[PDB]
């Protein structure tokens, strides 16, 4: 459930959301649209399949994995879009024509949206334009994204998450830098405060020679998860391919 | 249509990095100096220079 840097959040500015889009496909002859966001869908808190809810990233310095329901996600390009299906990392929906696509979660009054530009154009199949597939007509060859959840258009590669620094972990007191890990989590830290230094602290620990809070970094070793090869994360030292997951909704 | 995949970036943010040579299609790599990049804390580095 990584969170990354959307170019357009709710208000005006680029900022970090769990539901950034990064890429979009629009080649299905029906106009069905497949979207990839950093969030997940159809999985419960531990990751086990549960259609009615989804899990995503937390806006806190503990930065755990939080959850919500399907009834409060919305897709819209020019008007609201009708969701057709969802599978973990991926969404698919029908959208009206427009210039950009927006995914929005409405956790009550907590609105978090990402928008990305994509000139989606009403397309058709045949030698004549038409608004809708007519009741009567010839049956010709077309290609539409398969609504089935368990299809596969390909695979995407996932890797161990890299370092993810924080500042609540760090603190400045009387010109000395201390670390404040959360409860029971072995948090690795490093810096040069003069000479270089590294280790892991699970409790509030002091640092020597450290005069400024900006001098050091601390973060917990969360190797129990795999993250997409997103361009808005600093990867781990070893970026070996460690997981592949299917790209649902194969263009059948 | 090519899909342009951009791997996750890397920082050796007070050492030195070199762009190696890969075998990927139209592979491109480059190195930058002082960047001091922020992601969600507001600092991911020591030695801002």
């Amino acid at each position, epitope marked *: 459930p990584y969170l990354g840097f959307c170019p357009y959040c709710r208000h005006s500015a680029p900022c970090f959301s769990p539901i950034k889009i990064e890429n979009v496909w629009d080649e299905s002859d029906d106009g069905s649209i497949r979207i990839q966001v950093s969030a997940q869908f159809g999985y419960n808190q531990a990751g086990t399949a549960d259609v009615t809810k989804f899990r995503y990233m937390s806006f806190d310095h503990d930065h755990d994995i939080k959850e919500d329901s399907m009834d409060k996600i919305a897709i819209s390009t020019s008007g609201p879009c009708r969701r057709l299906g969802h599978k973990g990392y991926f969404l698919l929906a029908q959208c009206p024509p427009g210039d950009s696509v927006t995914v929005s979660i409405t956790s009550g009054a907590s609105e978090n949206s990402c928008t990305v530009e994509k000139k989606i154009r009403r397309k058709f199949v045949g030698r004549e334009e038409y608004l809708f597939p007519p009741v009567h007509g010839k049956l010709v060859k077309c290609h539409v994204y398969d609504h089935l959840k368990e299809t596969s258009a390909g695979y995407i590669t996932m890797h161990r998450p890299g370092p993810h620094a924080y500042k609540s972990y760090l603190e400045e007191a009387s010109g000395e830098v201390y670390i404040k890990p959360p409860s029971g989590k072995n948090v690795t830290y490093e810096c*040069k405060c003069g000479d*270089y*230094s*590294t*280790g*892991i602290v699970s409790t509030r*620990t002091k*640092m020597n020679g450290c005069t400024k809070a900006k001098q050091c970094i601390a973060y917990k070793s969360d190797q129990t998860k795999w993250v997409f090869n997103s361009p808005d994360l600093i990867r781990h030292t070893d970026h070996s391919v460690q997981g592949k997951l299917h790209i649902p909704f194969r263009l059948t | 249509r090519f899909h342009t995949v951009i791997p996750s970036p890397q920082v*050796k943010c007070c*050492g030195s990095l070199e762009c190696k040579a890969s075998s990927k299609a139209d592979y491109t790599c480059r190195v930058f100096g002082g960047v001091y990049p922020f992601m969600w804390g507001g600092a991911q580095c020591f030695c801002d220079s």
Partner: antibody
Amino acid sequence: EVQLVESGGGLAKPGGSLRLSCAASGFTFSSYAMHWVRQAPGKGLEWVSVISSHYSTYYADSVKGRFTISRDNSKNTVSLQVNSLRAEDTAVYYCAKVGRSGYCTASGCNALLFDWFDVWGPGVLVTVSS
Amino acid sequence: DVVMTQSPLSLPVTPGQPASISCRSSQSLVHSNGNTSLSWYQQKAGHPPRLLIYQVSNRYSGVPDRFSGTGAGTDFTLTISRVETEDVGVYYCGQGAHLPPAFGQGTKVEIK
């Protein structure tokens, strides 16, 4: 002041086991690789094992499968569990702190591989006899 | 494993005169930084070894100036310029640039 106290040694039977502890003070304990070295009576010392600040553990060849070094940074200690005791394990064991844990170059800054041991504890005697 | 050899095994000395301890490695001990990981320690009877020299030429703090370290490659020497009575004890060279760390067998320095 930097200080290392060793404890847990004494008399033991061959084939037995014992846990040694080294409590450290006066410096950032989590920031350094801790070493166990040994010197049995009348011989030179003998490096036994090291645990990095990243919990990476290396051992001498003579101590494989029997000695396990561990560490807790919260209470500032490094321990050595010893199993399958034998006669030549009889020695004074010294808990040792490197003055420097690594150095930095243009390719980055590196871990455990050291240049010198700056601090030694008083050491604790282990005597394996029948 | 790096083999470290010291000579002489016994070095009777006289106060007021210089003395030297010679040290050979089976391998080079230079790092990528160019610093060489050789260190000289003194051990007194009933006491843990105390660092004298690190980075063959650099003297540790509080060490008397009469101690000095020289050498390169695999050949190294510790020189006492003016032996004192407290200087008796067992002197060891050790290295840390190669795993496992290796130390010289040691030289006993005693007053003639």
